[PDB]
Amino acid sequence: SPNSQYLKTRILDIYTPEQRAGIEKSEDWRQFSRRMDTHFPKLMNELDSVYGNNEALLPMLEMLLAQAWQSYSQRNSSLKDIDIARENNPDWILSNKQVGGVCYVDLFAGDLKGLKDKIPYFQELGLTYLYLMPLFKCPEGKSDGGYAVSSYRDVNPALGTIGDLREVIAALHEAGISAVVDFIFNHTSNEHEWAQRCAAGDPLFDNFYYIFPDRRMPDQYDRTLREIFPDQHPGGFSQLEDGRWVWTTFNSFQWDLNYSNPWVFRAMAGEMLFLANLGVDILRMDAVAFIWKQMGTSCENLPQAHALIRAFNAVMRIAAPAVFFKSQAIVHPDQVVQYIGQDECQIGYNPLQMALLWNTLATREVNLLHQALTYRHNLPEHTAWVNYVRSHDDIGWTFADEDAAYLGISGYDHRQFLNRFFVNRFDGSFARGVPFQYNPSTGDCRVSGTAAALVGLAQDDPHAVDRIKLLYSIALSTGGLPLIYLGDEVGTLNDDDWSQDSNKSDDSRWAHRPRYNEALYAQRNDPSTAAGQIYQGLRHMIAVRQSNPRFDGGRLVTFNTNNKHIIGYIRNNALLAFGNFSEYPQTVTAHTLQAMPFKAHDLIGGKTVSLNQDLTLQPYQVMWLEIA
Ligand SMILES: OC[C@H]1O[C@H](O[C@H]2[C@H](O)[C@@H](O)[C@@H](O[C@H]3[C@H](O)[C@@H](O)[C@@H](O[C@H]4[C@H](O)[C@@H](O)[C@@H](O)O[C@@H]4CO)O[C@@H]3CO)O[C@@H]2CO)[C@H](O)[C@@H](O)[C@@H]1O
Ligand SMILES: OC[C@H]1O[C@H](O[C@H]2[C@H](O)[C@@H](O)[C@@H](O[C@H]3[C@H](O)[C@@H](O)[C@@H](O)O[C@@H]3CO)O[C@@H]2CO)[C@H](O)[C@@H](O)[C@@H]1O
Ligand SMILES: OC[C@H]1O[C@@](CO)(O[C@H]2O[C@H](CO)[C@@H](O)[C@H](O)[C@H]2O)[C@@H](O)[C@@H]1O
């Protein structure tokens, strides 16, 4: 395997003697060269563990490094300053000062220019991180809400131009907000040029996807493949009009890129560098679990998938240090955490905490949540969870069966309950969600619906507002970067038109992808409305989280409340948080609180509370006690 010093000499071969001498003593090369020596070894190792002795590896690598140099050379000076900062401050993602938001530009602000006008509100809310849903060219009509990419560089016409995007990012950076977008690197739409040329037989795009002549291998593969959208098609393949079959983990119009071909990695790295130079701070690595296939396995979370992501990480450490990765793996908890690492994905969605927040509201029992916060919360250094309550997706019950078993809970039986409960098919349920991808041959089902709809705000449940505040209080204080699904801060309900829109009716997720509700946002400052109650409640928690250093970092120690309905944990040994998931008042006995200070200030209610006496929490009440 070639070394850094060697590959660099060949990178400079494109220059004439006169030019070369000039490049070698330039500041940009000096930085690139230094980063090369520090991170190239990782890049080489990761690529070698995947491609091995593939004859194309070296040629691919050199081509990748050459364009990596050009990319960094072209990279804007301001971004290079952010690179140096991020380099010396890896834990910026762990700061309590960070609070993120996510929205669809079209649904939330109409278009990119319209989004730019929304920045003041984002600052008003306190955001320091803004994630924008798929913004690039995609098939007309059905594109899986933009996740079927037809181009990673041409902005969706309906949203604007690449120019508007560059303006938005700059404006966001001016407002003290990091820009976060998707890097749908596991698949492209079937209309993407690469897909068209590959299927057409263009030798330049040969083996860019997985295409088979018939069902022989697809059938073999399907023996162990999980079905993501069983409603769309069985197994993981879709048939082309010419009779052939292509690997389509998701919708039939989304073709899985073939990373077993090193040229595919190089290509995607090229697209990654493009996004990097737009000034993007964080790339949401979509479906990181599926980027590697192997007959006889689930084709999820395979070793090479982690290796490839770590290779991508190295490229950024070399050509754009400011760019971090956000894992979005919605899989078994043992698998979720493996993607999070300083050299892989620095942050990642915490689906386990999210799913259990909802689980707890339904059962009123914090057992699973407590268990999760006790054994699966803390992460290795320089990494952090992205805690959330809802997102653009359906809710999957990805808690661990093994974990549930230890508690005497049958995973399968429990999901049946959760699913029925949240789709309002369980007596007394306050939830008003809708089913998503019910799978007859497995019994698995997911849930769609906005946070407000799931807590009962649709029927005006008097507990709805407090439920929303309780859930978000957990995501905002457990440790990690909290991501708010914009629209939630004002109690936005499900969309009322999706089911009759022919391009959406077969995907219930659109039920929880409502547009900006002018009426609710106009009430965000009226304490007499649910919108104002929700907004002011969340904003207050946001203000406290960002100003109080006791919430800094991502580590926590759970506190046994001795009340099955109350969750408890401590941040930095100075902040004791209590959360009552019961619709009835619940108590934490004085006996349980004996080791705590006699008195402590509660940042939520702003009152001083005595801990040397029984502490009774009102229904769904949240307390953030400063015990130090
Ligand atoms: O305040 C509202 C209601 O609160 C109480 O009911 C709660 C239970 O206390 C919770 O434990 C939970 O019960 C679920 C349970 O979590 C779920 O697993 C499922 O239980 C199955 C089990 O999985 C299966 O293996 C087999 O044993 O059958 C069990 C029973 O179906 O379903 C339970 C609900 O039926 O949630 C409920 C509802 O919030 C209290 O008891 C109620 O009186 C009260 O209304
Ligand atoms: O953060 C320090 C410490 O926190 C946790 O311990 C607390 C318990 O969770 C909490 O229940 C309480 O313990 C009491 C017992 O429940 C009760 O049976 C009796 O023994 O009185 C105890 C009070 O001394 O308080 C402790 C201390 O805060 C966590 O479990 C520890 O691992 C952690 O070191
Ligand atoms: O229910 C959706 C399904 O897909 C996952 C895979 O991680 O979600 C991401 O990728 C999908 C396909 O590209 C997108 O449709 C989805 O919006 C995106 O979040 C999981 O959430 C789940 O298994």
Side-chain angles (χ1 to χ4, degrees), residues 97-359:
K97 296 191 170 306
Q98 294 287 152
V99 170
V102 52
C103 69
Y104 284 89
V105 177
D106 68 309
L107 298 182
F108 198 85
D111 55 32
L112 287 171
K113 286 177 188 173
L115 186 289
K116 204 165 67 59
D117 292 325
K118 296 290 185 170
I119 298 184
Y121 171 60
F122 298 151
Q123 301 176 88
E124 183 196 329
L125 177 58
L127 304 190
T128 61
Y129 172 123
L130 178 71
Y131 162 37
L132 302 178
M133 304 304 300
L135 307 164
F136 293 81
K137 183 184 191 302
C138 59
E140 183 179 303
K142 292 161 180 284
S143 66
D144 186 17
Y147 277 89
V149 182
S150 294
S151 173
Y152 297 92
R153 311 194 186 201
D154 301 307
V155 179
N156 178 330
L159 303 178
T161 65
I162 186 63
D164 296 304
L165 180 54
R166 206 181 274 88
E167 280 182 52
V168 167
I169 300 178
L172 286 173
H173 280 172
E174 198 290 309
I177 300 179
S178 300
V180 181
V181 303
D182 288 272
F183 183 51
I184 311 172
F185 77 142
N186 173 264
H187 45 279
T188 79
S189 73
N190 56 351
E191 283 174 40
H192 190 297
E193 176 180 345
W194 299 352
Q196 290 172 172
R197 301 181 64 174
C198 174
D202 189 324
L204 180 54
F205 290 84
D206 191 71
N207 204 52
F208 249 63
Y209 302 83
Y210 304 85
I211 301 180
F212 304 97
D214 50 48
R215 289 297 307 193
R216 188 174 66 79
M217 289 181 78
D219 281 5
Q220 290 186 296
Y221 280 123
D222 278 0
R223 293 179 192 168
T224 60
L225 293 186
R226 173 167 59 103
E227 305 191 311
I228 307 304
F229 299 143
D231 271 6
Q232 296 303 309
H233 63 77
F237 306 81
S238 298
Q239 183 172 55
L240 305 184
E241 281 159 39
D242 67 34
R244 292 181 298 170
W245 297 79
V246 54
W247 202 311
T248 62
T249 296
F250 303 102
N251 282 286
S252 294
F253 51 78
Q254 285 164 302
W255 294 9
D256 291 51
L257 285 166
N258 189 173
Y259 282 95
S260 64
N261 176 358
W263 294 117
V264 169
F265 176 86
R266 202 286 303 188
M268 289 310 268
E271 301 306 296
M272 184 176 279
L273 287 167
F274 169 76
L275 291 175
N277 276 8
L278 292 182
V280 175
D281 289 287
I282 301 178
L283 286 169
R284 181 177 173 287
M285 308 301 284
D286 194 68
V288 297
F290 311 87
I291 64 178
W292 191 262
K293 326 294 182 182
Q294 175 56 234
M295 179 60 74
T297 72
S298 67
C299 293
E300 295 184 57
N301 321 299
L302 294 179
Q304 293 88 337
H306 288 287
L308 285 168
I309 299 172
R310 290 194 297 264
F312 277 117
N313 182 120
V315 177
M316 292 296 99
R317 302 288 76 65
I318 299 171
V323 181
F324 274 43
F325 298 158
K326 172 168 62 175
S327 176
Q328 45 60 87
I330 311 300
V331 297
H332 188 289
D334 290 332
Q335 302 311 307
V336 172
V337 70
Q338 288 159 170
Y339 291 99
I340 304 175
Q342 182 169 39
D343 303 333
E344 202 163 322
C345 290
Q346 303 89 348
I347 66 181
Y349 282 82
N350 186 0
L352 181 58
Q353 181 184 298
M354 180 282 289
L356 291 189
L357 288 186
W358 290 107
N359 168 80

Side-chain angles (χ1 to χ4, degrees), residues 359 361-365 409-410 413-414 417 421 426 583-584:
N359 168 80
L361 282 182
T363 69
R364 278 78 159 169
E365 299 179 293
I409 294 173
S410 171
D413 291 351
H414 201 59
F417 161 67
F421 180 94
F426 183 78
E583 63 269 51
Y584 306 115

Side-chain angles (χ1 to χ4, degrees), residues 60 89 93 114 157 182 297 346 357 470 569 573 597:
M60 181 283 274
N89 178 35
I93 53 178
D182 288 272
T297 72
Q346 303 89 348
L357 288 186
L470 168 63
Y569 52 88
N573 251 299

Side-chain angles (χ1 to χ4, degrees), residues 350 352-354 356-358 360-361 366 369-370 373 377 387-389 467-482 538 541 545 551 556 566-569 571 577-581 604 621-624:
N350 186 0
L352 181 58
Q353 181 184 298
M354 180 282 289
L356 291 189
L357 288 186
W358 290 107
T360 309
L361 282 182
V366 305
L369 175 62
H370 174 78
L373 299 179
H377 185 76
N387 306 314
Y388 59 123
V389 178
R467 285 177 176 136
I468 294 175
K469 296 190 301 178
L470 168 63
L471 297 191
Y472 268 104
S473 78
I474 300 298
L476 292 166
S477 62
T478 44
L481 206 158
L538 268 56
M541 292 191 280
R545 167 193 165 76
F551 298 79
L556 77 71
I566 304 172
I567 191 67
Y569 52 88
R571 303 308 316 298
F578 284 134
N580 176 21
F581 283 77
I604 296 298
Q621 170 169 32
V622 181
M623 272 183 63
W624 286 356

